[PDB]
Write a protein that binds this ligand. Structure first.
Ligand SMILES: O=C(O)Cc1ccc(OCc2ccccc2)cc1
Ligand SMILES: [Zn+2]
Length: 258
């Protein structure tokens, strides 16, 4: 497979290799704030990242992933809409060429500069590969980024990007604390959806925080210096690596807050 974000291999083409691209629970979606309903039965969200063990950062030619040790329950997401325990495996971002675009989810059609995805898998399925074959296999925590003040907790990420410029490059990335990427409030919207990249599997409970984080123009500018291409190939800047909003179909977005 040779999918990407360009004219010739972008989201409009994905359905030919990945027919589930036109499925019934695809992501992302527009979150219409006047149609999402407060759900008083949602339990409180529990983000337990105190023992998180980051290992490595990888440019995979689509984004960069910060990878965690998920061999035990070190960093987990529980509560909210979730049953059981979901283990953090990696985070990555989607971003734009310009500050007015970049997020995958939109809020009343508003696009943010970027979107962070913290990816967790359901431990009742034993491993990540098994979990993605299940409708409740993954829980992705989605956080919007807007351009304003710098995010101190992001700077370690920004500063390693020079060392993973091109596809297939990785760097050691130990002792990074993903708690520094969270906003103050954990108010969220939730709905059932999919991976937003091939293979687009319909295995995700999406939990999208209402409060964006602010990052600086300098910080996001450094995301935009990454490359989709490998070393010694023609330079294609890693920008606009976001899939646009997909049909909501027969789904309801629930709000954790009134
Ligand atoms: O957070 C996102 O963008 C969704 C997302 C989360 C995890 C992810 O992992 C890669 C992958 C999953 C299944 C099969 C092959 C590759 C791919 C997409
Ligand atoms: Zn993502």
């Amino acid at each position: 497979h040779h999918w990407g974000y360009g004219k010739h291999n972008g989201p409009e083409h994905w359905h030919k290799d990945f027919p589930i691209a036109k499925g019934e629970r695809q992501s992302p979606v527009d979150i219409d704030t006047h149609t999402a309903k407060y759900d008083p039965s949602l339990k409180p969200l529990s983000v337990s990242y105190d023992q998180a063990t980051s290992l490595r950062i990888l440019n995979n030619g689509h984004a960069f992933n910060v990878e965690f040790d998920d061999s035990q329950d070190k960093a987990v997401l529980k509560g909210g809409p979730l049953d059981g325990t979901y283990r953090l495996i990696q985070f990555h971002f989607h971003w734009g060429s310009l500050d007015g675009q970049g997020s995958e989810h939109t809020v009343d059609k508003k696009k943010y500069a970027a979107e962070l995805h913290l990816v967790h898998w359901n431990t009742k399925y034993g491993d990540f590969g098994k979990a993605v074959q299940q409708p409740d296999g993954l829980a992705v925590l989605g956080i919007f980024l807007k351009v304003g003040s710098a995010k101190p907790g992001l700077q370690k990420v920004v500063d390693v990007l020079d060392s993973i410029k091109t596809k297939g490059k990785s760097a050691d990335f130990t002792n990074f604390d993903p708690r520094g990427l969270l906003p103050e409030s954990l108010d969220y919207w939730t709905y059932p959806g999919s991976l937003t990249t091939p293979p687009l599997l319909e295995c995700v409970t999406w939990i999208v925080l209402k409060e964006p984080i602010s990052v600086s123009s300098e910080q996001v500018l450094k995301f935009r210096k990454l490359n989709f291409n490998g070393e010694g190939e023609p330079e294609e800047l890693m920008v606009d690596n976001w899939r646009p909003a997909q049909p909501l179909k027969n789904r309801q977005i629930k709000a954790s807050f009134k």
